[PDB]
């Protein structure tokens, strides 16, 4: 009664007042709770579950099942209290104040007998009121919970069920683990449709049925740090909270949640703008403003991104897995920097894992983390920890030919399944990344490659890695005609690093054909060529 | 929330004691977008130390007075809260928890409180441990129901080490990335603050001082961020002018930079 009201909140009285949101679904889970609560001994369930799957929502479904009377008669007219363990530790400076407050709770529960004492965060019970010489609240409740003279629901994260309830193996016996699972997407749509009126009333927006269908499928496909019955409400809220913001009714639609999810992970999931659609159809031409003369790769990386933006990509494979073969200097990294520029506006927005820094496996732990017990376990992996922050991210495995024979086998799981578990124990998704594998690659008597370079990738890579690469693109060597076009790119933006009184270099002369000649060989690339443009016409016309 | 463990930033913004915030108008909208949510309305401000994360909230506390609210943030007082000040003075049981349950009792009774807690790496382990009762166990039931609006502030590493490693704390604080400002954005910060620094030091800060303070601070100082290492240069130069006494220019902020870094002349 009055003792329980000052140490906790009545959830049954909160369900009479309508303060608990509707719990649509979870009928078989609340039935499992009421099954455990109707036992004679050890009538104590624990809603173990992933964080955010609605563990405390199942009990809110129970508190409004008592008010509706949908409980069995053994649980009819029960008063379900969220026991605030901080309220019991509060004002317990002296010895025996906490143990007095906990026995005063239990004396009221034995008196009334209609109390189900929901202890949210049951891992906090081990060590609750534990001082130098005190009795923790576990050891006071253990005779109560074992005899079934105290009905108590727990709610614990599965991570927090190992560390504090399985490290107290006596207390684990007193409870029953009711596995509250991560629901399916169709169950989450019914959760969202049942919560339609609560978020219509607070955000003052109508939320359509397709928006509920989107925010369950969009969250499951494109968000991995949370769980379904929460990361779907999360997209419904910041939809409607933006409409309270920008209007200071407007319906929440598929476009209103996809623009939230685009501002959430950085993954463009939009119902596409016509201006965005035009630059995707001419993506192969708008990547011709940084690289020229490929015409097979710049088309085939444009096919993979349009396949992603039209939603026709395999939702368990990456957005595009490529090998950029060919001779050196033909625009391999310069296409990946162009591909990152189209998708982000930043050339350093890609994740360049230099595979030349790896040659063995005994340093290969910076891309999938260190295993437990070994150093580098709490900051495990530099590839994974940058991809779970940018799930849409072109990553660039530059110079894979200088790497180990058993480091791309770690990435062999990334190409098909789109995942990679780091050493920490956490699965990161590569399903939305664009994987790039840059590789630097006739002899004798023949009547007059593409064939030998496939054989030399078959020598270097296993044919099981090439099996999982979506597009293998051998690059064509730069013709002397298009080196005329290549030097025109340097006199514009690398001469745009220059200040526009310190230069006048767009001359339109015929001496650029001499600049096209100096710095290029049939064995060299255009890098020994981009250096000669800087140090001969740009950087020495600037120091005066 | 008492004025013992923090202060009312909206009552300070009504009296005009907070810094004028020029820039960060897009970040304040993202904080209002997270604060206007029915559940999980808890924006953690992820940014490098001293990029203006309080200056987001000081500008947000002004926007309560200026009326830029989404009508769910209307007439909401915003008490800042030092989470470590509740920790300070706790050697015995129920010292931290009593002072934390008091300040949460004064939110349910008052009913318009938006806590700004800094140092959310202190939140995990504010008490003895996680199995013990800490502030990362008391706040969490009310941070999932939207009955408690707390604005956070981590670095990015503190967010990775203490919140992303904490199960069931990632889902309760929603990330708002306060970025590192550019050099022109930093000058516009200094153009708005100059009515405070010229009226406090009783000097005149020229326009040439601020274009140098946004350039020399990036050029010479790398252990600390811009929207603070540039504010500091025109702060100490006004104090050095008050001490030597008046006009601050790119020569008055000059020797202030030479005081710290190992530059003989």
């Amino acid at each position: 009664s009055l003792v329980l009201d000052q140490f906790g909140r009545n959830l049954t009285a909160a369900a009479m007042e309508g303060k608990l949101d509707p719990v649509i679904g979870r009928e078989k889970e609340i039935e499992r709770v009421m099954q455990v609560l109707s036992r004679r001994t050890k009538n104590n369930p624990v809603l173990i579950g992933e964080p955010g799957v609605g563990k405390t929502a199942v009990v809110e479904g129970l508190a409004q099942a008592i008010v509706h009377g949908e409980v069995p008669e053994t649980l009819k007219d029960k008063q379900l209290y969220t026991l605030d363990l901080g309220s019991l530790v509060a004002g317990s400076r002296y010895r025996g104040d906490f143990e007095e407050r906990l026995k005063k709770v239990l004396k009221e529960i034995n008196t009334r007998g209609d109390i189900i004492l929901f202890i949210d965060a049951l891992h906090t019970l081990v060590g609750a009121g534990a001082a130098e010489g005190a009795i923790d609240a576990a050891s006071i409740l253990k005779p109560k919970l074992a005899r079934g003279e105290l009905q108590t629901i727990g709610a614990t994260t599965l991570d927090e069920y190992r560390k504090y309830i399985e490290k107290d193996a006596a207390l684990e016996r007193r409870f029953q683990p009711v596995q509250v699972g991560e629901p399916t997407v169709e169950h989450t749509i019914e959760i969202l449709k049942g919560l339609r009126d609560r978020y219509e009333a607070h955000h003052r927006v109508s939320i359509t049925d397709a928006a509920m269908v989107a925010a369950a499928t969009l969250a499951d496909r494109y968000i991995n740090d949370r769980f379904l019955p929460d990361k779907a409400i999360d997209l419904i809220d910041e939809a409607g909270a933006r409409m309270r913001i920008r209007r200071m009714v407007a319906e929440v639609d598929d476009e209103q949640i996809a623009e939230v999810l685009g501002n959430w992970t950085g993954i463009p999931v939009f119902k596409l703008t016509e201006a965005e659609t035009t630059r995707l159809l001419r993506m192969e031409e708008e990547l011709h403003k940084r690289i020229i003369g490929q015409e097979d790769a710049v088309k085939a990386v444009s096919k993979a991104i349009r396949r992603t933006r039209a939603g026709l990509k395999d939702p368990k494979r990456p957005s595009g897995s490529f090998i950029f073969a060919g001779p050196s200097g033909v625009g391999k990294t310069e296409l990946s920097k162009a591909l990152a520029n189209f998708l982000f506006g930043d050339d350093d927005a890609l994740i360049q894992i230099d595979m030349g820094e790896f040659h063995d496996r005994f340093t290969a732990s910076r891309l999938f983390g260190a295993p437990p017990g070994y150093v580098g376990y709490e900051e495990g992996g530099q590839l994974t920890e940058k991809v779970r922050r940018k799930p849409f991210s072109v990553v660039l495995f530059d110079a894979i030919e200088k790497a180990h024979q058993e480091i791309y086998n770690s990435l062999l799981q990334v190409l098909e399944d789109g995942r990679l578990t780091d050493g920490q124990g956490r699965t990161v998704d590569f399903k939305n990344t664009v994987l790039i594998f840059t590789s630097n690659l006739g002899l004798g008597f023949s009547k007059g490659m593409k064939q030998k370079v496939n054989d030399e990738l078959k020598k270097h890579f296993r044919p099981e890695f090439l099996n999982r690469i979506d597009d293998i693109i051998v690059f064509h060597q730069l013709t002397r005609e298009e080196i005329i076009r290549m030097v025109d790119l340097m006199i514009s933006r690398v001469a745009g690093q220059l200040k526009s009184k310190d230069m006048a270099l767009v001359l339109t002369d015929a001496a650029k054909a001499l600049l096209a000649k100096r710095g290029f060989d049939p064995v060299l690339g255009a890098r020994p060529l981009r250096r000669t443009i800087q140090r001969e016409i740009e950087d020495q016309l600037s120091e005066k | 929330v008492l004025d013992q463990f923090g202060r009312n930033l909206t009552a300070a913004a009504m009296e005009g004691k907070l810094d004028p915030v020029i820039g960060r108008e897009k970040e304040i909208e993202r904080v209002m977008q997270v604060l206007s949510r029915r559940t999980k309305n808890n924006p953690v401000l992820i940014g490098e130390p001293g990029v203006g994360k309080t200056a987001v909230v000081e500008g947000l506390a002004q926007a309560i007075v200026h009326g830029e609210v989404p009508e769910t943030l209307k007439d909401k007082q915003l008490y800042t809260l030092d989470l470590g000040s509740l920790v300070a003075g706790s050697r015995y049981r129920g010292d931290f928890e009593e002072r934390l349950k008091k300040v949460l009792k004064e939110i349910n009774t008052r009913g318009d409180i938006i806590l700004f807690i800094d140092a959310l790496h202190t939140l995990v382990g504010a008490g003895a441990a996680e199995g013990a009762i800490d502030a990362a166990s008391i706040l969490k039931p009310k941070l999932a129901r939207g009955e408690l609006q707390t604005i956070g502030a981590t670095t990015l590493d503190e967010y990775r080490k203490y919140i992303e490693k904490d199960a069931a704390l990632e889902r309760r604080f929603q990330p708002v990335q306060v970025g590192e400002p550019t050099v022109e954005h930093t000058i516009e910060i200094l153009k708005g603050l100059r009515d405070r620094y010229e009226a406090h030091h009783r000097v005149s800060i020229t326009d040439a001082a601020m274009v140098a303070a946004a350039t020399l601070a990036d050029r010479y100082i790398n252990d600390r961020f811009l929207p603070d290492k540039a504010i500091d240069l025109i702060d100490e130069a006004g104090a050095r002018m008050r001490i030597r006494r008046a006009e601050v220019d790119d020569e008055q902020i000059a020797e202030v930079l030479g005081n710290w870094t190992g530059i003989p002349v």
Binding site: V375 | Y92, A132
Partner: peptide, 24 residues
């Protein structure tokens, strides 16, 4: 590579309850 991490667990910094001295 096979450099072990050495957990190095601290002793428990914990609270203390109180016997109190009675006064009028």
């Amino acid at each position: 590579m096979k450099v072990l991490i050495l957990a190095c667990l601290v002793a428990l910094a914990l609270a203390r309850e109180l016997e109190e001295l009675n006064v009028p």
